[PDB]
């Protein structure tokens with residue numbers, strides 16, 4: 001069983017969102033698919049369901065603005081919501097009970113941001129290791145991922161081969177209205193001259209991918 | 220229309236201790252209650268359904284119990300991997316609803332931060348702005364105070380900080396504080412310092428660089 005969702009993105013208020021959930025390993029004529037969302041710093045909220053038989057049920061607090069539909073032959077379920085407000089910003093999931101009594105299978109989530117701002121890809125700056133970021137035989141280095149909108153970005157090191165010691169911080173909204181975050185990793189200080197360290201930044205809302213080599217700081 | 224109250228809202232336990240999470244429904248939901256584990260940067264995963272059924276693949280240390288309006292998730296001996304938010308939900312009647320979640324955090328020995336400082340990259344300076352980053356790595360507990368000083372002037376209102384979720388393999392946190400200035404302001408000063416206060420430190424520690432180097 002698998003549920004895979006379309007990608008994150010930005011929609012303006014009073015406009016409408018549409019998300020696709022593509023299912024595999026079961027048939028939509030046998031299992032109902034639900035939509036659940038998680039607003040920033042809040043708990044889960046059930047939105048609605050389209051049952052195998054094709055009838056729908058909706059959260060009554062939202063049903064005037066919500067529509068759930070499906071295409072059985074394509075194994076796709078669609079969520080549509082209009083008259084969007086800022087507080088519709090959330091991680092949206094499709095889910096199914098399958099053969100169980102709770103949400104046993106979940107999609108990977110679709111981050112929908114409602115805002116009048118424009119999409120902007122990040123600037124990526126190195127946090128170069130130096131005598132000032134060394135503690136004994138340990139050095140820290142990183143990359144500053146700055147001035148992007150909306151969330152999210154994914155940061156990896158050396159295409160994802162490097163995970164030990166990596167800390168990618170939650171983004172913060174700057175006073176400009178753009179997000180900024182850092183990702184750091186600690187390595188042996190003697191590795192700085194012999195090992196390449198590259199941060200890889202992916203901002204799917206802007207379909208941007210950036211790689212920055214992080215070299216030790218010069219004089 | 221059925222309201223699920225989880226308590227406590229957060230807790231901190233040592234590895235191997237027994238954990239008890241509570242969930243209270245505002246009306247009788249019989250046994251239609253599920254528990255979900257959400258680790259950072261992941262989807263919720265089902266642990267318990269029908270109040271007491273352990274879901275496929277869930278370790279035996281997770282047990283659900285309760286009925287009607289009072290429900291419990293116990294972890295018989297908590298492990299460092301069990302760090303997560305735990306959600307309860309009812310599917311007894313429309314609309315299905317969930318509690319607000321309980322954040323489970325782990326206890327460990329006090330661990331002071333290693334402090335590192337990063338001057339702005341030269342590529343960023345050419346754009347007109349300067350970010351100076353102070354990093355506090357692998358400390359415990361979470362509480363820490365970071366103060367920026369520029370040529371000994373204590374700064375306020377021009378920095379922002381972020382703290383990672385607790386690490387699942389050493390139960391520590393890290394923190395980044397970012398000081399932002401115009402390039403013009405950055406170039407008007409020499410010394411950039413961050414001073415860190417933490418339970419694991421005798422006295423506040425300072426980390427600095429001088430642009431004149």
Ligand SMILES: CC(=O)N[C@H]1[C@H]([C@H](O)[C@H](O)CO)O[C@@](O[C@H]2[C@@H](O)[C@@H](CO)O[C@@H](O[C@H]3[C@H](O)[C@@H](O)[C@H](SCC(=N)NCCCC[C@H](NC(C)=O)C(N)=O)O[C@@H]3CO)[C@@H]2O)(C(=O)O)C[C@@H]1O
Pocket residue numbers: 030031032033051052053054055096097098099251310311312313
């Ligand atoms: C493989 C298989 O068997 N597939 C089934 C699927 C499948 O089981 C589900 O999709 C889950 O994956 O189900 C199919 O059947 C659906 C369909 O019939 C729809 C129609 O709306 O209903 C679905 O059942 C749900 C009920 O509608 C819903 O009411 C309950 S709430 C939990 C409950 N049992 N409460 C009891 C009392 C309710 C409160 C009561 N108030 C009243 C009575 O008004 C009071 N006393 O206060 O959840 C049900 C699901 O758990 C049904 O599953 C489908 O998807 O089409 C058939 C397919 O063959």
